[PDB]
């Protein structure tokens, strides 16, 4: 009578949901803080040039 471990399954499902959330946080931070800092400083250099 082989057992599937429901606590391992739910544990990896939770941790992959936290990987998927970390990837979304990094990827959205890049798309609100970093790229908006970069594209502004670029355009403010070009418009003073």
């Amino acid at each position: 009578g082989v057992r599937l471990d429901l606590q391992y399954l739910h544990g990896k499902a939770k941790f992959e949901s936290e990987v998927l959330t970390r990837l979304r946080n990094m990827r959205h931070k890049i798309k609100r803080e970093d790229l908006v800092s970069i594209e502004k400083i670029i355009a403010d250099r070009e418009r003073e040039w």
């Binding site: 391992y8 990896k12 992959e16 990987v19 970390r22 990837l23 990094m26 890049i30 970093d34 970069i38």
Partner: protein, 52 residues
Amino acid sequence: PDCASNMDNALMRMESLEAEMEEVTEQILTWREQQKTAFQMNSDANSSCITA
């Protein structure tokens, strides 16, 4: 047992592909702001030379 063993062996390589993205993001952002300190300090340094 081998299904479970190979599946965890897959997820640890997906976890490893998250880890390479956030460290390479911090390498890019570290170098971005390193360069600006060198560019700033050259303006202060050359401004001082005018005094001579």
